[PDB]
Design an enzyme around this catalytic site. Structure first.
Site, PDB file in Angstrom:
ATOM      1  N   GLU A  70       1.050  -1.090  -0.034  1.00  0.00           N
ATOM      2  CA  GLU A  70       0.041   0.374   0.267  1.00  0.00           C
ATOM      3  C   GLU A  70       0.596   0.902  -0.204  1.00  0.00           C
ATOM      4  OE1 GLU A  70      -2.384   1.520   3.269  1.00  0.00           O
ATOM      5  OE2 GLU A  70      -2.209  -0.376   4.243  1.00  0.00           O
ATOM      6  N   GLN A 125     -13.732   8.178  14.551  1.00  0.00           N
ATOM      7  CA  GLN A 125     -14.941   7.732  15.516  1.00  0.00           C
ATOM      8  C   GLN A 125     -14.991   7.205  16.229  1.00  0.00           C
ATOM      9  OE1 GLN A 125     -16.667   5.737  11.264  1.00  0.00           O
ATOM     10  NE2 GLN A 125     -14.504   5.187  11.164  1.00  0.00           N
ATOM     11  N   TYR A 137     -21.190   7.887  10.712  1.00  0.00           N
ATOM     12  CA  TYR A 137     -20.183   9.013  10.714  1.00  0.00           C
ATOM     13  C   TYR A 137     -20.150  10.843  10.607  1.00  0.00           C
ATOM     14  CZ  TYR A 137     -15.888  11.209   7.690  1.00  0.00           C
ATOM     15  OH  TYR A 137     -14.471  11.398   7.523  1.00  0.00           O
TER      16      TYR A 137
HETATM   17  N1  LIG Z   1     -18.263   7.043   5.146  1.00  0.00           N
HETATM   18  C1  LIG Z   1     -17.377   7.064   6.245  1.00  0.00           C
HETATM   19  N2  LIG Z   1     -17.470   5.720   6.884  1.00  0.00           N
HETATM   20  C2  LIG Z   1     -17.016   5.595   7.786  1.00  0.00           C
HETATM   21  N3  LIG Z   1     -15.769   6.456   8.298  1.00  0.00           N
HETATM   22  C3  LIG Z   1     -15.193   7.703   7.279  1.00  0.00           C
HETATM   23  C4  LIG Z   1     -15.645   7.843   6.397  1.00  0.00           C
HETATM   24  N4  LIG Z   1     -15.471   8.823   5.115  1.00  0.00           N
HETATM   25  C5  LIG Z   1     -15.004   8.609   5.240  1.00  0.00           C
HETATM   26  N5  LIG Z   1     -14.600   8.262   7.479  1.00  0.00           N
HETATM   27  C6  LIG Z   1     -13.149   8.653   7.506  1.00  0.00           C
HETATM   28  O1  LIG Z   1     -11.967   8.313   6.944  1.00  0.00           O
HETATM   29  C7  LIG Z   1     -12.123   6.914   7.623  1.00  0.00           C
HETATM   30  C8  LIG Z   1     -11.252   6.419   6.648  1.00  0.00           C
HETATM   31  O2  LIG Z   1     -10.285   6.679   6.211  1.00  0.00           O
HETATM   32  P1  LIG Z   1      -9.349   5.862   5.080  1.00  0.00           P
HETATM   33  O3  LIG Z   1      -8.506   6.990   4.214  1.00  0.00           O
HETATM   34  O4  LIG Z   1     -10.730   5.069   3.655  1.00  0.00           O
HETATM   35  O5  LIG Z   1      -8.387   4.451   5.727  1.00  0.00           O
HETATM   36  P2  LIG Z   1      -8.592   2.905   6.012  1.00  0.00           P
HETATM   37  O6  LIG Z   1      -7.627   3.151   3.984  1.00  0.00           O
HETATM   38  O7  LIG Z   1      -7.741   2.540   6.666  1.00  0.00           O
HETATM   39  O8  LIG Z   1     -10.180   2.618   5.468  1.00  0.00           O
HETATM   40  C9  LIG Z   1     -12.478   7.415   8.459  1.00  0.00           C
HETATM   41  O9  LIG Z   1     -11.882   6.788   9.943  1.00  0.00           O
HETATM   42  C10 LIG Z   1     -13.585   8.359   8.976  1.00  0.00           C
HETATM   43  O10 LIG Z   1     -12.778   8.695   9.682  1.00  0.00           O
HETATM   44  C1  LIG Z   2       2.441  -0.553  20.440  1.00  0.00           C
HETATM   45  O1  LIG Z   2       2.327   0.479  20.051  1.00  0.00           O
HETATM   46  C2  LIG Z   2       3.660   1.467  20.006  1.00  0.00           C
HETATM   47  C3  LIG Z   2       3.516   2.727  19.503  1.00  0.00           C
HETATM   48  C4  LIG Z   2       3.506   2.876  17.882  1.00  0.00           C
HETATM   49  C5  LIG Z   2       2.389   3.864  17.264  1.00  0.00           C
HETATM   50  C6  LIG Z   2       2.962   3.983  15.992  1.00  0.00           C
HETATM   51  N1  LIG Z   2       2.097   3.243  15.066  1.00  0.00           N
HETATM   52  C7  LIG Z   2       2.206   3.522  13.444  1.00  0.00           C
HETATM   53  O2  LIG Z   2       2.965   4.249  13.075  1.00  0.00           O
HETATM   54  C8  LIG Z   2       0.966   2.838  13.038  1.00  0.00           C
HETATM   55  C9  LIG Z   2       0.054   3.779  12.513  1.00  0.00           C
HETATM   56  N2  LIG Z   2      -0.747   2.904  11.136  1.00  0.00           N
HETATM   57  C10 LIG Z   2      -0.452   3.475   9.700  1.00  0.00           C
HETATM   58  O3  LIG Z   2       0.856   3.720   9.342  1.00  0.00           O
HETATM   59  C11 LIG Z   2      -1.556   2.745   9.680  1.00  0.00           C
HETATM   60  O4  LIG Z   2      -3.433   2.935   9.735  1.00  0.00           O
HETATM   61  C12 LIG Z   2      -1.646   1.146   8.729  1.00  0.00           C
HETATM   62  C13 LIG Z   2      -2.492   1.127   7.452  1.00  0.00           C
HETATM   63  C14 LIG Z   2      -1.129   0.334   9.600  1.00  0.00           C
HETATM   64  C15 LIG Z   2      -0.520   1.077   7.602  1.00  0.00           C
END
Ligand SMILES: Nc1ncnc2c1ncn2[C@@H]1O[C@H](COP(=O)(O)OP(=O)(O)O)[C@@H](O)[C@H]1O
Ligand SMILES: COCCCCCNC(=O)CCNC(=O)[C@H](O)C(C)(C)C
Ligand SMILES: Nc1ncnc2c1ncn2[C@@H]1O[C@H](COP(=O)(O)OP(=O)(O)O)[C@@H](O)[C@H]1O
Ligand SMILES: COCCCCCNC(=O)CCNC(=O)[C@H](O)C(C)(C)C
Lengths: 266, 263
Positions: A70, A125, A137
């Site tokens: 990704e 959320q 949301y």
């Molecule tokens: N329709 C929706 N339903 C739920 N969350 C939404 C929606 N639109 C936007 N969001 C927001 O976007 C976030 C998801 O972002 P996104 O970049 O798609 O993440 P992921 O790739 O981790 O699913 C949710 O946590 C919320 O804050």
């Molecule tokens: C035990 O946790 C130690 C603290 C870690 C906090 C840092 N966490 C991260 O960097 C991951 C944050 N999230 C992301 O990068 C994204 O949501 C993905 C999808 C996991 C790539």
């Protein structure tokens, strides 16, 4: 028809390409079953997958599918969208603000993950829910736009009273730091939700400006679905990035960067 | 008697030297600190922090006032040396009502960032999620809280798929809440998750600037650590995971009060 999918923790992002006509589609990860069903009915020339739930999709479908990491997919899709929308940025930080936040440095040719944090959409959320019992949301984010943070957040000038502070006095000093000075105030769901977003926005931005400095770029590109229907989150992020001497950029369909990238790889 | 005071947003830290005494009082009770001061025979009074001015105006003796960043740096080097550490360089993260981060290069300090996730957020958000206002009570309650139904981990998102970063990492703070709506969110679990997020943000910021300024040493200070073993553990564990040495300091919260004295 060619298809790219970024199956994230919360949202499934789908791009369909057909004769240079592009379709942008969102579906909940909760409803991944219906995405798989849709796919199995279609005539697809090429299917590319990325994100954490890519595997769930790939296993339950009847056709082959290339799977990409990704971080690389997001970088490639974002450069495609940046070009299309008239930005030629030599280099930049990008902050993919999804369920969580991942931060990247793009040097002009390729990207590198330079950090991440768990303050992002999933926190808006989840903590949003705990503070308001709102699970929808749209409703959650609408309500927050109507919010005031002044009784909740503590500013540098609140601490330094009538003294000259050693950093600008309008800065947030402590998120939720004012709550204990206003216990004779009844904290409304809007105020509280505005402060959730407030803290998420300031953490992401702080992290982004910090790595911008480290990798000697002034450009910060913000993407992810966390921005949809949340003008307040853009403003907080935008205002503070500017305050720090960096250029913020949002991108039309920035949340689909990963789905697009998957299409235009290998 | 010489006296140094770091009058912060939440706590007033007092060092008396008569040659050391360490004393804390609430910023809410600044009035009583001023009263105490006006009764005393003081050879030298040094002040720092945001509420230094409030003290300085209401006292009936002179007082030097120093900037808190330089004071904290000076006091912390005194305490580091006293406690056996010879660190060539280091990041220090002053975790107070809010958090200020600094790079000390061996001769002087520079502020390299800050964030509003800190002790004030533990109290404030803590209050909103539990209605507990007493600090000792709030922090005690958080200590054996469970975060697993509240936080989302990298492996929860990459369910049966090789993640591209370690799967035990927190992916989204409070990101699991919406998958456990049948579940009772207890005040302990919720408070453990507040501290969790504050701990991970501070640490992330600190390890990031540690890398930037090419040091592996990170010194954590501020009263936000007092009666909060969970906040130390979260910060400590993650700093180590990131290839940095964490350090706590005996009376690290008084670094600013001490520094004011020795400037
Ligand atoms: N329709 C929706 N339903 C739920 N969350 C939404 C929606 N639109 C936007 N969001 C927001 O976007 C976030 C998801 O972002 P996104 O970049 O798609 O993440 P992921 O790739 O981790 O699913 C949710 O946590 C919320 O804050
Ligand atoms: C035990 O946790 C130690 C603290 C870690 C906090 C840092 N966490 C991260 O960097 C991951 C944050 N999230 C992301 O990068 C994204 O949501 C993905 C999808 C996991 C790539
Ligand atoms: N007795 C206490 N009363 C209130 N807060 C405390 C106490 N002990 C520790 N704390 C925590 O310490 C934080 C203040 O940290 P400190 O370094 O003293 O900063 P400041 O200089 O802004 O007062 C509070 O926000 C709270 O999280
Ligand atoms: C308008 O909002 C600006 C966004 C928040 C920006 C970052 N905030 C900070 O750097 C302040 C953090 N706080 C601190 O460093 C300390 O508490 C002091 C005492 C104010 C120095």
């Amino acid at each position: 028809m060619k298809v790219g999918i970024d199956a994230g923790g919360t949202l499934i992002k789908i791009v369909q390409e057909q004769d240079n006509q592009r379709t942008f589609k969102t579906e909940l990860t909760k409803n991944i079953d219906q995405v798989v069903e849709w796919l199995n009915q279609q005539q697809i020339e090429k299917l590319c997958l990325t994100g954490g739930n890519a595997g769930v999709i790939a296993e339950n479908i009847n056709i082959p599918a290339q799977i990409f990491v990704e971080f690389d997919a997001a970088s490639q899709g974002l450069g495609i969208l940046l070009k299309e929308q008239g930005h030629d940025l030599a280099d930049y930080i990008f902050a993919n603000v999804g369920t969580g936040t991942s931060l990247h440095y793009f040097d002009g040719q390729s990207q590198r993950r330079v950090g991440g944090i768990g303050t992002g959409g999933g926190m808006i959320q989840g903590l949003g829910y705990l503070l308001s019992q709102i699970t929808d949301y749209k409703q959650l984010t609408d309500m927050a736009q109507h919010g005031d943070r002044n009784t909740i957040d503590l500013k540098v000038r609140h601490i330094y009273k009538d003294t000259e502070p050693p950093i600008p006095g309008d800065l947030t000093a402590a998120n939720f730091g004012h709550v204990l000075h206003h216990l004779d105030a009844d904290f409304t769901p809007s105020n509280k939700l505005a402060a959730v977003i407030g803290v998420v926005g300031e953490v992401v931005t702080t992290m982004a400006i910090t790595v911008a400095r480290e990798f000697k770029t002034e450009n910060i590109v913000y993407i992810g679905s966390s921005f949809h229907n949340n003008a307040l989150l853009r403003k907080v992020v935008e205002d503070y990035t500017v305050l720090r001497g960096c250029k913020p950029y949002y991108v039309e369909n920035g949340a689909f960067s990963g789905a697009i990238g998957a299409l235009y790889l290998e």
